């Protein structure tokens, strides 16, 4: 709810380049600056003879700079015999970053066999750990042809573990059975050799080939990491959307010896159960939880007609090994809710992680919507607390696809709150939404006495029936915010009487039914309270002694004086921002 939609950062790349197809963060060595990593897989580069090689750009929080992963053209196997084809390789289709490491891949990279003249899409990745740039093509092997890893398209999806292992998905391996490959980063760079086209890694973990019934399964279509067998080693989660006769499945493998741990299965044919997956602990139990998107899920409408809305299943991990699974249906028809799932960390710093789910084709003009969901003790809140709307219309070709890729859980502005990058490759754009600080306010209101006598003269005046109004105010926040929060408080006596009626209350010295007061209070210290005297009008001035006198107290914030150096204005917690009211009565008999 606290994402700043008033002043978001708009980053742009070359038009038609699908700029924003993959997004991620960049946090290098020590306490340095932070960057946005954006993929543009159809982007023309300066590579000799390479048309639309693609690139990954480093943007500053505010110009963007291309990252030089590879400046060379197509290597030759022999004279007039090109070894590789980097044109239209879609480099930057998936970008994943861990500390000072940036991993980008080219899923549509084709490579000619070293036995004969083929053009097989084995896929390749480039890894940059500071200065050294290495190549990584675990599917570029001697296991050629569709039967092997020739059509693997390694690097279609990637992720990092907490133990410096890379997780790579290859949906085309073994006649499109798919394959997961995991290599230690110490081995990737050490065993790299620009003169060796098929490097064999000893600590490689891979899903070996199975029976022919499992062909055309697309294992490795999406990936995510998290511990599930309760050992400490990040395990491999991957969607298998065409498995189970187009029902869609998700396989879980152990991250130590590549063994199957748990299975999930879609519940509707061709719902693409497994298009996107994510792993993050959502209910504060230190057990990573599985989020599976099925953007093509069709549910039944109220009228009995089917409607494609997409579905995400939420599976809560338990120590007993089981899973508590629920299902979250999309809101808009054909929006493909569940196309992208980005763990956000604790977006609002409430003690429970939160998550974003995108419907890249929802909203007006099919521009795109991103829904923000908050965690709680019982799991994920099914109702979204914030709606991110796309602003960019569809020129021609692909729709804007706002939300198609996203990544969270990184506080890029050191504001105390993790922020969120949202890609929209159809309009070549990426947008940074900054989390606004959340102010929790506890307001109080005491009215003593409750019963106002018709003639109780006590407070000094040259004396009329008067009473004390004591209102207390306390505020706090959890992040990087200033101490002094300036509040504007308004009080209205006897509001129930609309403008034009007969009023019956007004402050003692202000001589005015309303009293304004500018209030600087400090968060965290103590509750600052203030008393003041208001009185009732004489009996003969109004015959209306039946209309209960409601004391109304309203409070607001300045925001401008509570903003940050970056102009990020805080925001109140959503269920408890309101003003409060109480009342006193005149009795008889």
């Amino acid at each position: 709810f606290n994402l700043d939609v008033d002043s978001p950062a708009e980053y742009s790349g070359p038009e038609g380049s699908y700029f924003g197809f993959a997004v991620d963060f960049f946090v290098p060595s020590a306490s340095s600056r932070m960057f946005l990593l954006v993929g543009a897989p159809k982007a023309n580069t300066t590579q000799p003879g390479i048309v639309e090689g693609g690139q990954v750009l480093k943007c500053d929080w505010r110009r963007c700079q291309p990252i030089e992963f590879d400046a060379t053209g197509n290597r030759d196997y022999a004279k007039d015999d090109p070894l590789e084809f980097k044109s239209h390789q879609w480099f930057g289709a998936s970008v994943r970053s861990k500390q000072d490491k940036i991993l980008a891949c080219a899923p549509l990279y084709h490579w000619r066999t070293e036995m004969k003249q083929e053009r097989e899409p084995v896929g390749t990745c480039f890894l940059q750990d500071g200065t050294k740039t290495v190549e990584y093509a675990p599917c570029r092997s001697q296991d050629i042809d569709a039967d092997g890893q020739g059509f693997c398209q390694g690097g279609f999806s990637i992720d990092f573990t907490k133990a410096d292992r890379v997780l790579l998905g290859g949906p085309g391996s073994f006649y499109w059975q798919g394959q997961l490959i995991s290599d230690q980063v110490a081995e990737i760079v050490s065993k790299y050799d620009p003169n060796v086209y098929s490097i064999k890694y000893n600590n490689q973990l891979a899903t070996r080939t199975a029976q022919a019934i499992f062909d055309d399964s697309y294992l490795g279509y999406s990936v995510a990491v998290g511990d599930f067998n309760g050992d400490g080693i990040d395990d491999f989660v991957s969607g298998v959307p065409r498995a189970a006769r187009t029902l869609g499945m998700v396989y879980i493998y152990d991250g130590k010896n590549m063994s199957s741990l748990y299975n999930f299965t879609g519940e509707q044919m061709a719902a693409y159960f497994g298009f996107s997956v994510a792993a993050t602990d959502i209910n504060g139990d230190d057990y990573a939880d599985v989020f599976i998107g099925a953007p093509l899920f069709m549910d039944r409408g109220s009228d009995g007609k089917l409607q494609e809305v997409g579905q995400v299943s939420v599976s809560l991990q338990r120590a007993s090994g089981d899973f508590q699974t629920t299902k979250l249906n999309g809101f808009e028809v054909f929006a493909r809710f569940g196309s992208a799932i980005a763990p956000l960390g604790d977006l609002d710093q409430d003690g429970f992680n939160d998550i974003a789910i995108a419907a890249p084709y929802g909203g007006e003009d099919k521009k795109g919507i991103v829904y923000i969901f908050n965690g709680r003790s019982t799991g994920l809140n099914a109702v979204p607390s914030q709606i991110l709307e796309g602003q960019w219309a569809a020129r021609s070709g692909c729709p804007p696809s706002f939300g198609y890729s996203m990544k969270g859980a990184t506080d890029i502005d050191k504001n105390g709150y993790p922020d969120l990058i949202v890609g929209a490759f159809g309009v070549d754009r990426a947008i940074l939404y900054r989390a606004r600080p959340v102010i929790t306010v506890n307001a109080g209101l005491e009215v003593y006495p409750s019963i106002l006598n018709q003639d109780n003269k006590t407070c000094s005046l040259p004396k009329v029936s008067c009473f004390n109004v004591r209102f207390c105010l306390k505020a706090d926040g959890k992040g990087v915010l200033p101490r002094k929060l300036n509040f504007q408080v308004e009080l209205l006596l006897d509001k129930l009487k609309q403008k034009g009626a007969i009023r019956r209350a007004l402050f003692l010295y202000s001589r005015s039914p309303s009293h304004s007061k500018n209030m600087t209070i400090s968060r965290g210290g103590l509750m600052q309270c203030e008393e003041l005297i208001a009185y009732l009008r004489d009996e003969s001035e109004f015959r209306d002694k039946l209309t209960p006198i409601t004391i109304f107290m309203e409070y607001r914030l300045d925001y401008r004086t509570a903003a940050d150096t970056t102009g990020l204005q805080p925001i109140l917690n959503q269920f408890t921002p309101a003003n409060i009211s109480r009342q006193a009565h005149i009795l008889l008999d």
Binding site: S29, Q99, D164
Partner: protein, 297 residues
């Protein structure tokens, strides 16, 4: 006198933070307060024998020789059996996660010679499984010991078994020893006051409601984190007189510690070296070289 006044204001901010409190609470008796909590306070100061917040200390006494403690045991003159009720344990500490430290304390009487003691746990209400061990010294005065059974108490609060207990026999040479008297009350306090009680230290529900290289190397900390540092002898020192090793990960602690608190290492590891002395090779081990963890104190 100015040096001492700065620490006091840090103690003020520490105690309130340890209680997770911003301000102290807001009477009776004009005489001495109840000796039920003075028995706890006299039992907490009596020491013969991460988590910086406070722990609420409560205790529970054992069951007399009545209440069915006798139809099962009673006569093994070389042992002592102790039993407790779970209906009162899960009331001082509701959630097993709140339990932090649970040490079982007894009371010694015999002062002459020495004995060897083995401790067991109650399983299947008939079988006993080994726990810990401790040798005893002839102290001329009554001494108070304690056995850390936190791991045992934690599992018992998760179970609905309303009857549990412990067993204290002597050494088994593979012959019974330890308790040479058959009254069972000569060596320890039976059926009297100051009888064995289980001292508990848990965290209130009001509260709940130092990582090492496994976190400091996978994340970029701005605070007191242990940074990586591989020290080579030939490269960073110019020492070719040390055969093994020829380089190691000593690391260091760098980082701030706010609420002068410094980033000091908490856990260190020794390093074995191999060097020659003229013609005599000596394999020696240096103490505390590899910095594992780092703390702020």
């Amino acid at each position: 006198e100015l040096v001492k006044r700065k620490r006091i204001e840090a103690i003020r901010g520490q105690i309130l933070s340890k209680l997770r409190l911003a301000s102290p609470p807001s009477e009776v008796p004009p005489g001495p307060l109840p000796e039920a909590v003075l028995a706890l306070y006299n039992s907490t100061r009596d020491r013969v024998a991460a988590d910086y917040y406070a722990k609420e200390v409560t205790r529970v006494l054992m069951v007399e020789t009545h209440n069915e403690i006798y139809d099962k045991f009673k006569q093994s003159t070389h042992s002592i059996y102790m039993f407790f009720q779970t209906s009162e344990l899960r009331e001082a500490v509701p959630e097993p996660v709140l339990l932090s430290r649970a040490e079982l304390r007894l009371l010694r009487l015999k002062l002459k010679v020495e004995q060897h003691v083995e401790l067991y746990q109650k399983y299947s209400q008939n079988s006993w499984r080994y726990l810990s061990n401790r040798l005893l010294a002839p102290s001329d005065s009554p001494e108070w010991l304690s056995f850390d059974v936190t791991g045992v108490v934690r599992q018992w609060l998760s179970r609905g078994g309303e009857i549990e207990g412990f067993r204290l026999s002597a050494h088994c040479s593979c012959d019974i020893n330890g308790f040479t008297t058959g009254r069972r009350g000569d060596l320890a306090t039976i059926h009297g006051m100051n009888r064995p009680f289980l001292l508990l230290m848990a965290t209130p529900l009001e509260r709940a409601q130092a990582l090492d290289t496994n976190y400091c190397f996978s994340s970029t900390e701005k605070n007191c984190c242990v940074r990586q540092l591989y020290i080579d002898f030939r490269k960073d020192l110019g020492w070719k007189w040390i055969h093994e090793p020829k380089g190691y990960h000593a690391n260091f602690c760098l980082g701030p510690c706010p609420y002068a608190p410094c980033c000091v290492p908490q856990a260190l590891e020794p390093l074995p070296i191999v060097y020659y002395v003229g013609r005599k090779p000596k394999v020696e081990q240096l103490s505390n070289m590899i910095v594992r963890s780092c703390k702020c104190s």
